Ligand binder design. Structure first.
Ligand SMILES: [Ca+2]
Ligand SMILES: [Cl-]
Length: 194
């Protein structure tokens, strides 16, 4: 029994967006979704934050898959990852939006750049840790590599978001088309680690 919130960077450097919705489809279709099973909410951030749907909006896997396919890329000049994570913690994981007392809490964060608000990450991550939110973080290195930008500081930032052990919770994904390849391992760990 898990409440899972997926936190999606919507910035326009991620391309094609079909790669992200394919990742969502493949990950979510392997779950048993319902008010007494797994619940999924999805938040998208860029420059601001939007709840695509709350944890208790949908009570079946079929419904979640239909909604996930329709999620549009929202774009954004800036990448406010700390705001996205903090909003997932303070808003998505609330009883008002369907969060359940006593279930396992998992956040999955998908991003392709360093965050403009990275000075907030230390506090935001510690607040998630205090609230028992297990964090899987996914760095997509595609746009950085395509722009010949160094990725080492980026990888370090996204690793810092992942729960320990870091190597089980952090995924380095070379490019958008490779995102779907992590689904089997990610799903296994979501339901195996605490
Ligand atoms: Ca970006
Ligand atoms: Cl209510």
């Amino acid at each position: 029994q898990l409440d899972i919130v997926i936190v999606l960077d919507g910035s326009n450097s991620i391309y094609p967006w079909d790669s992200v919705t394919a990742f969502l489809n493949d990950l979510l279709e392997r779950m048993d979704i319902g008010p007494k099973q797994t619940q999924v909410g999805i938040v998208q951030y860029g420059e601001n934050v939007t709840h695509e749907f709350n944890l208790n909006k949908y009570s079946s896997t079929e419904e979640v898959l239909v909604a996930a396919k329709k999620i549009v890329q929202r774009g954004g000049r800036q990448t406010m990852t700390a705001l996205g994570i903090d909003t997932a913690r303070k808003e998505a994981f609330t009883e008002a939006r369907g969060a359940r007392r006593g279930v396992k809490k998992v956040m999955v964060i998908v991003t392709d750049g360093e965050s403009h608000d990275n000075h907030r990450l230390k506090k935001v991550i510690q607040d998630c840790e205090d609230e028992n939110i297990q964090r899987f973080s996914i760095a997509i290195l595609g746009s950085y590599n395509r722009g010949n930008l160094s990725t080492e500081k980026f990888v370090e930032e996204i690793k810092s978001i992942a729960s320990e052990p870091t190597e089980k919770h952090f995924f380095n994904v070379s490019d958008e088309l490779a995102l779907v390849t992590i689904v089997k391992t990610l799903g296994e760990r979501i339901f195996a680690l605490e």
